Amino acid sequence: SNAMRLPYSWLREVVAVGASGWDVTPGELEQTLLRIGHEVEEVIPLGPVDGPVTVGRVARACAVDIGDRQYREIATNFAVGDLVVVALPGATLPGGFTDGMICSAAELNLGASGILVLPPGAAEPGADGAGVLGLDDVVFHLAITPDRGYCMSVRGLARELACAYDLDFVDPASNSRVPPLPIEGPAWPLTVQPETGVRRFALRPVIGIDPAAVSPWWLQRRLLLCGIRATCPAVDVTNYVMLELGHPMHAHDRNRISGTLGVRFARSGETAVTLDGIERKLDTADVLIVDDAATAAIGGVMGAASTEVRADSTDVLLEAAIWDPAAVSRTQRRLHLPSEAARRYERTVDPAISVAALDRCARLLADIAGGEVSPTLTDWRGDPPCDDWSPPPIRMGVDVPDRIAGVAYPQGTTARRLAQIGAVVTHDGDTLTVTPPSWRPDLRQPADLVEEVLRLEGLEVIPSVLPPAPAGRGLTAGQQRRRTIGRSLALSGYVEILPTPFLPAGVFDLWGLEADDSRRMTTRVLNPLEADRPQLATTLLPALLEALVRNVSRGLVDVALFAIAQVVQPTEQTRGVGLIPVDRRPTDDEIAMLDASLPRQPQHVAAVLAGLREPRGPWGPGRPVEAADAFEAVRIIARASRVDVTLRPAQYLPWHPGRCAQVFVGESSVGHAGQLHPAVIERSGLPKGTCAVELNLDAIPCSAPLPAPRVSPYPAVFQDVSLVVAADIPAQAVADAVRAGAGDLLEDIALFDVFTGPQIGEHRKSLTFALRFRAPDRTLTEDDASAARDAAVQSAAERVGAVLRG
């Protein structure tokens, strides 16, 4: 999780150390955080309450001392003697909740079972509840981006505010703010395997704490406002320092540690019982903390119950470690443990504050629990020991942020901002050498430095300068064609939909396809939203037919839908390629290898029709959808593509075998059209007579014809010819044969009669075409047009076996 919660009082406190009297409106602070790159999710205040809300002491009803000896009476949490907060009769708790009532952290709008129990000495019985609880405070819920793991604490966010407001900042992790505890010897024997990714491991024990002691109210309150429930002073300080400095801390029971501590990779099948009392199956790529007996903690995730601080621990060994971010993120996501420590370790933690944050816990623990800080310390800092945790320096021009932003910043802006975020900046002519601080591993390239200068100066100063328009070529031929196809279909009565690539469950089984059908060879999705729809679409019809059913099932029974989208047609099993190094450009052989591993994804156009094709009106009763309407959709797409198509009968499911046409462009098959099979319509719940079209736009070649027609000024000759052919002879084949024979005099040919009957014969039909002959340079005689007609008749007899009607 990228969530970070802290109250305004704690954030203002750290900022006010360097800038005394600094205080801004929470609305203004939200605009400042949102302006420097921190997304604010919510700005929730506390409470509020008024009137009878005070703190009392208990003496399961019991007398509650509301103050000044005015005892009033009113679940398993508190006992006798614990200071509690009560909304005295006539309550006004958020929002409008009106004997007495012992309030809780949730009823008062302050935290998360039982009632609220203030620690002994937090407030005299009778003090103002709103003043003790600090209800005037405001909690900020921030969503920290993964590149700013240093902002997972008050230290980082207070530093960001000091940068935005140009303030003097006092690092709460410095040795002037955290006095270095003495180092008089080792704290505990420690062994570490250097191949596990640990950068630093620090240990310091605390001796003789009071088990019955509890954390003060200011410490417990800041934990609840940050989303962490208080437990005991030993654990409360470990979570409090994590929220303050960003270095997560974990407390162990010093007396419950047997032998030498050891950071080591886990083993297969090894299970460690964490602090929550749950068995966790571990992997060989996990980091652990073990001793001579069991496992003490999981590296950077959560401690184990073997060394868990109980409610009676007196000797505590505090841990300050720096784990590998990749190993922590890989481990916490496997067993689902988004703990506060794992979320910060995966975003990297400042390795230079390990001892500083360690000494922060010891002094804070011994103060509130009455312990004695041991002057021993074991600080393993790698092999060889690392004493400088600074990242490599970065070089960039002094005006690079000015060029990237397009703003002429005042001189010294880049150097001031980079030093403001904690980087060492040296000058060498016009080149800056920038060494980022140890808490900024994200700064690695000049672009990272540019972001820091631009976000701190504010992106509002960047002007709006439209770049010069390059000499573009515009829409390609295929892009223009898809528009024309969409326009032509929409103007013909079709409604476009957005098809879904996930096929319905067993759609091809409903279509009755064979087992070896190429459309069944789909691409499966590993994690689909519906477990019964993992296969990707090899055809746009199921998505269209699904939308057709949706419209019909809702009262729209006369539908004509179309869609233009790609399909997913794999040619082999799902095969991936190896990782190509990102530090260079992949060669053309590796690029072609990447394309070959991907399934064929051609762009298809498809359409479905059902109900009335033409609606009824004052002209007539309308016309139901028939297969010819699907064939006309082919012609509409063809005219939009400026190509000639031919239709031939074909048997291709889910289309009706006697009402299906295969569309060809020249000699290449581009798709099918016609009416769907009645069995497919019945099993799929489709309306009767449903027709469908689907074409492959990639198979249709882009054409750019340049016609040069010559309008003849001479009169035309009109003639009609009737030809008798077999029933299975397509009318287009007769028209093509007549055209091929008539010659250049034939200006136009149109079919206008299809006649069957006993005068013609069984399984035969008569076709009458209207012919228009015209010469380009003369007036024709009737014999001249009849000669071209007789040649067309002879050409029809030789190609389709036509007989002149007698």
Add this chain to the structure above:
Amino acid sequence: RGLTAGQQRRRTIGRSLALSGYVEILPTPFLPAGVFDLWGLEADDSRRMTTRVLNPLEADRPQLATTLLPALLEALVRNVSRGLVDVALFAIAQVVQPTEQTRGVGLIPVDRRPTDDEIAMLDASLPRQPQHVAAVLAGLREPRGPWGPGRPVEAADAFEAVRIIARASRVDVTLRPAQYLPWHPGRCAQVFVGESSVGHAGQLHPAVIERSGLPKGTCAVELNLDAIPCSAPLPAPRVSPYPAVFQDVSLVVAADIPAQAVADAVRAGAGDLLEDIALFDVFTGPQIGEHRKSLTFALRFRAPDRTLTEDDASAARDAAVQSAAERVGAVLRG
């Protein structure tokens, strides 16, 4: 910034008419000789107030076009006279409609920039030149084939050309009966966008057809695109998941009542529950009465948040029936 809204609309109108069966031509600005005398226009007709060219190629054609119809009809005659009898033509061009006599402006010194007032003076001295769209139809509107003998051109085809231009312009138009030459007075509609007149459509006057040598039943349409405001609608449909109710209402009105006026009265009375209304019957049988007609509309009621009962839809139908009785004098059939 690319194409303006007007340039973008001119493309869409051309595409829609071409895909609907019309053939684009380039209209000549020079009017034919005495074409307005063939149309029978009055002496004070605004279309006669033309701009004349001093040195035309043809001395009998000096006037510039105040309307696109004469050039379309001349191109219509050329196609029909050469064996192309079933033709639908359209054109998108400007006209020249002066508001005064030809008045010129003196020579402005070109050694400087003309002031904004001098630029406005040069524009006021020029005749008004708005963009017009027009079309003409003759012969068969739908050709013959294996489906049947086709359908000859009628006035409704010209009315549909208006709705094609309207849908391409994304504007709502209304058609009203009008007497405007050269159209047939009983088959002529005036097109309105809201309350502004933008043109006319229908079948041409039979006398104008005879005097001009046009095919019988010739239809025409002309619209002023400048009088049509460029619209950029932003719809926000709310698809209701609840079922609809289907009912039909048969109303008897006088023959002169337009069918759209009845539909507008039914919608005004039905309310928000009315999702769709469509006319599908115009009956003029003897049991209806002389000069009276019966209109039957298909109604589709649907609520956005509940499932209606038959009484709920009937209550909206009855309220629609009363609205028609009050606005167009409709009587419920029975």
Add this chain to the structure above:
Amino acid sequence: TLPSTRVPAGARHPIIMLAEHVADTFIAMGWELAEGPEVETEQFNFDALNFPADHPARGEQDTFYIAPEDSRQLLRTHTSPVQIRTLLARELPVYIISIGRTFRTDELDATHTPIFHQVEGLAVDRGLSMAHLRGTLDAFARAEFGPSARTRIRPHFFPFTEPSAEVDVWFANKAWVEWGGCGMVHPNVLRATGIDPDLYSGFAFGMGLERTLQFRNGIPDMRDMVEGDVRFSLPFGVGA
């Protein structure tokens, strides 16, 4: 006044029309369009875009992966790999727009959809700055939200951009509305495509079409945009 429309006109989808209008806006500014496969390799969808090895978006939680496991093949979580293919195939300078189908793990409700369309821009040339990005975003906003449209950028983070920013739009037809993201092309992305970061800079941006169409027109239920109901598409007119 009798009805004469014997063939009632249909309608192109509003998302397609919005995509076409977005395309024409950038074509008018010298840009071009490019297409890419929806089933994309992990090399072009994550690796070439400076996504770390253990990035949470590379898991089975947010990205539709292709079976079997560890196949390095997935449905694209953005049209950015289309720009990577353009940066590898075309010569500099490059001013291209990618409008394609995008796939995310979010369920389909009134304000989210797993299958949405987004527009992503990519400009790489000598001397491109954030000011050139903001100027392009403003011209994009004015063409889609009116002359009074203005954009605002707030610093953010994206793996393939540095510095990164989110874009908010202001339109006087409803305040600031979250529109999309942008930023300068990360030098790692340029090195992954054989381009010198010291000689060529560049910016990028990305907005969702269903998101853009939702708050602009005020469409309440976004499920009506993808379910293909005729009652949703028809009011938007026939199309261009």
Add this chain to the structure above:
Amino acid sequence: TLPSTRVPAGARHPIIMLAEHVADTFIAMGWELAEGPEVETEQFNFDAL
């Protein structure tokens, strides 16, 4: 293969299509399209030129 196009498709004029192709060519390079009156004053047709 029977004829099914009951609405005979028309055609935009080639000159109009060429002008549209020419316009898109320059708009793709950043240019814009302007219009003017065919009946023009002699000041703008000759004197200003």
Add this chain to the structure above:
RNA sequence: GGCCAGGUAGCUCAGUCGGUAUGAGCGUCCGCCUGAAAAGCGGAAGGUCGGCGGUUCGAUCCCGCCCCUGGCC
């Protein structure tokens, strides 16, 4: 990962811990009616009650698992 609460006709939803869901509203069909319609009146069609199994002479209703939704986390 927790008990729960939900998936039921074309659409929107009620209802039963075992033999009939005498399911509702709207949608579909027939008759009277109309030139043809609708309404009205009078008749009907249509669900394998979330899937695979378990018990039972018999399961929408009880055991188990899962598919997908909210809830509260």
